[PDB]
């Protein structure tokens, strides 16, 4: 995705923009007591720790766009992609302005805590004003759909979260581009039974894990991805998606039946709002649009397909297995296949597909190695058939040492342990030890080991 042109929005007209531009994120009590480098992102363009221009590092992730019209290779990996999602019997019947606003089952109503986006942001109205969940009102939606339409601009927020040193001064805090209500309600209204399959289907069918429990789906991926084995990440996926992949995704779309894969050009080229300054782009995943995380997984399903045909000759695509969650990827195939030429082979497409985290360089993927949403496998000692995702310590500790309001520094450290125990009995009494330090760690109730352990057991 590259930025085809700037312009303010005084020339449009429309009421610019204030963006947060604080950190809420202070260091925690347990600062101190845990080890950890990350610092917030930075989001004012004075910041003291920046070594850089931020207008210019906020946008550096759009490298570039190539240019094609689909090759034969990537157009046998949508008609196979396409074929395996046909399998599921996706109904391709449209939602309904209640379903979509307040969920079925399959889907969850959009959340009221997420900006409605343009043009209600500079309005003062918010989601709560349109939206009542215990009524289920369609008259307000309604009554603002017909009024701004659909098609709308999307409003560029820069995310507040903890970033490594380096993303720190080198100004990389990304963006959130988010979407109007309209848009995510029109789309989720027709797309909405796409996003039903998707939720319902994690595997490796769908080729997505998007929405599933780690702690279950864990003990079943190793089922499922019977076969030699690959990992993969990328850095900038969104950015970075030229426009051919976003026409085979509609192209997948339009084959399983879903008029409104119109849509997808929608999000192809898009406006964003940022501060001022309105920017228009060619390609890029809008990171917040309504759709995204299925979106991705899709085009990372034909992005690994093409690229293996690309590289290889003989090659039964039937036997290879994907699961992506957006950019996260493990991959199996009987034979085994070089994760560096893929790497090498998809930089051609503009892509800058890399190892899996927790990985220095490509070696053979390994259960003992593999990462998936920042995750290990680690398989459970009485019963080596589950398996626990173990969330490294390094990241946990990470998280803990800092609180955007320590009222909640219960349920954020709570949260923490239903991760944190994974890693065995030994380490999270040395974790909660540790917590119960600090004064108000040992006011905190914790779960003990045990109880962990059993809640976990029952959820088979
Ligand atoms: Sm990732």
Same mark, same amino acid.
Request: proline fraction near 6%; charged fraction near 25%; charge should be negative.
């Given at each position: 995705?590259?930025?085809?042109?700037?312009?303010?929005?005084?020339?449009?007209?429309?009421?610019?923009?204030?963006?947060?531009?604080?950190?809420?994120?202070?260091?925690?009590?347990? /600062?101190?007591?845990?080890?950890?480098?990350?610092?917030?992102?930075?989001?004012?363009?004075?910041?003291?720790?920046?070594?850089?221009?931020?207008?210019?590092?906020?946008?550096?992730?759009?490298?570039?766009?190539?240019?094609?019209?689909?090759?034969?290779?990537?157009?046998?990996?949508?008609?196979?992609?396409?074929?395996?999602?046909?399998?599921?019997?996706?109904?391709?019947?449209?939602?309904?302005?209640?379903?979509?606003?307040?969920?079925?089952?399959?889907?969850?109503?959009?959340?009221?805590?997420?900006?409605?986006?343009?043009?209600?942001?500079?309005?003062?109205?918010?989601?709560?004003?349109?939206?009542?969940?215990?009524?289920?009102?369609?008259?307000?939606?309604?009554?603002?759909?017909?009024?701004?339409?659909?098609?709308?601009?999307?409003?560029?927020?820069?995310?507040?979260?903890?970033?490594?040193?380096?993303?720190?001064?080198?100004?990389?805090?990304?963006?959130?581009?988010?979407?109007?209500?309209?848009?995510?309600?029109?789309?989720?209204?027709?797309?909405?039974?796409? /996003?039903?399959?998707?939720?319902?289907?994690?595997?490796?069918?769908?080729?997505?894990?998007?929405?599933?429990?780690?702690?279950?789906?864990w003990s079943?991926?190793?089922?499922?991805?019977?076969?030699?084995?690959?990992?993969?990440?990328?850095?900038?996926?969104?950015?970075?998606?030229?426009?051919?992949?976003?026409?085979?995704?509609?192209?997948?779309?339009?084959?399983?039946?879903?008029?409104?894969?119109?849509?997808?050009?929608?999000?192809?080229?898009?406006?964003?709002?940022?501060?001022?300054?309105?920017?228009?782009?060619?390609?890029?995943?809008?990171?917040?649009?309504?759709?995204?995380?299925?979106?991705?997984?899709?085009?990372?399903?034909?992005?690994?397909?093409?690229?293996?045909?690309?590289?290889?000759?003989?090659?039964?695509?039937?036997?290879?297995?994907?699961?992506?969650?957006?950019?996260?990827?493990?991959?199996?195939?009987?034979?085994?296949?070089?994760?560096?030429?893929?790497?090498?082979?998809?930089?051609?497409?503009?892509?800058?597909?890399?190892?899996?985290?927790?990985?220095?360089?490509?070696?053979?993927?390994?259960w003992e190695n593999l990462?998936?949403?920042?995750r290990y496998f680690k398989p459970d000692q009485?019963?080596p058939?589950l398996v626990h995702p173990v969330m490294p310590?390094?990241?946990?500790?990470?998280?803990?040492?800092?609180?955007?309001?320590?009222?909640?520094?219960?349920?954020?450290?709570?949260?923490?342990?239903?991760?944190?125990?994974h890693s065995g009995?030994?380490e /999270?009494?040395?974790?909660?030890?540790?917590?119960?330090?600090?004064?108000?760690?040992?006011?905190?109730?914790?779960?003990?080991?045990?109880?962990?352990?059993?809640?976990?057991?029952?959820?088979?």
């Amino acid at each position: 995705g590259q930025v085809i042109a700037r312009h303010k929005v005084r020339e449009f007209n429309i009421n610019p923009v204030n963006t947060p531009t604080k950190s809420k994120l202070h260091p925690s009590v347990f /600062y101190d007591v845990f080890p950890g480098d990350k610092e917030p992102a930075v989001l004012s363009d004075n910041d003291p720790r920046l070594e850089v221009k931020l207008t210019e590092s906020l946008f550096s992730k759009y490298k570039g766009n190539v240019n094609t019209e689909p090759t034969e290779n990537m157009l046998v990996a949508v008609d196979h992609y396409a074929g395996q999602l046909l399998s599921l019997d996706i109904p391709t019947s449209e939602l309904t302005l209640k379903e979509a606003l307040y969920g079925v089952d399959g889907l969850e109503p959009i959340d009221i805590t997420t900006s409605a986006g343009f043009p209600y942001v500079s309005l003062g109205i918010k989601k709560r004003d349109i939206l009542n969940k215990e009524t289920q009102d369609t008259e307000k939606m309604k009554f603002y759909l017909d009024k701004y339409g659909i098609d709308l601009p999307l409003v560029t927020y820069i995310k507040d979260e903890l970033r490594s040193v380096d993303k720190v001064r080198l100004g990389k805090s990304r963006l959130i581009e988010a979407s109007s209500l309209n848009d995510s309600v029109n789309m989720r209204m027709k797309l909405g039974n796409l /996003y039903k399959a998707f939720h319902q289907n994690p595997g490796v069918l769908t080729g997505s894990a998007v929405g599933c429990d780690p702690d279950v789906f864990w003990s079943v991926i190793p089922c499922l991805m019977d076969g030699h084995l690959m990992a993969f990440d990328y850095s900038n996926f969104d950015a970075s998606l030229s426009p051919v992949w976003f026409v085979c995704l509609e192209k997948v779309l339009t084959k399983l039946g879903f008029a409104g894969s119109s849509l997808i050009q929608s999000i192809c080229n898009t406006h964003h709002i940022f501060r001022d300054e309105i920017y228009v782009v060619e390609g890029g995943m809008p990171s917040g649009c309504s759709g995204t995380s299925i979106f991705n997984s899709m085009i990372n399903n034909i992005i690994i397909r093409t690229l293996i045909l690309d590289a290889y000759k003989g090659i039964d695509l039937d036997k290879l297995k994907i699961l992506a969650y957006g950019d996260d990827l493990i991959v199996s195939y009987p034979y085994e296949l070089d994760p560096q030429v893929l790497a090498t082979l998809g930089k051609n497409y503009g892509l800058t597909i890399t190892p899996p985290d927790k990985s220095e360089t490509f070696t053979k993927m390994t259960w003992e190695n593999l990462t998936f949403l920042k995750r290990y496998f680690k398989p459970d000692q009485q019963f080596p058939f589950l398996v626990h995702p173990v969330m490294p310590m390094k990241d946990i500790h990470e998280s803990i040492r800092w609180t955007k309001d320590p009222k909640n520094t219960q349920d954020h450290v709570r949260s923490l342990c239903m991760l944190a125990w994974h890693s065995g009995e030994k380490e /999270y009494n040395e974790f909660i030890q540790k917590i119960r330090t600090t004064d108000i760690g040992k006011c905190l109730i914790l779960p003990e080991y045990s109880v962990l352990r059993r809640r976990w057991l029952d959820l088979f």
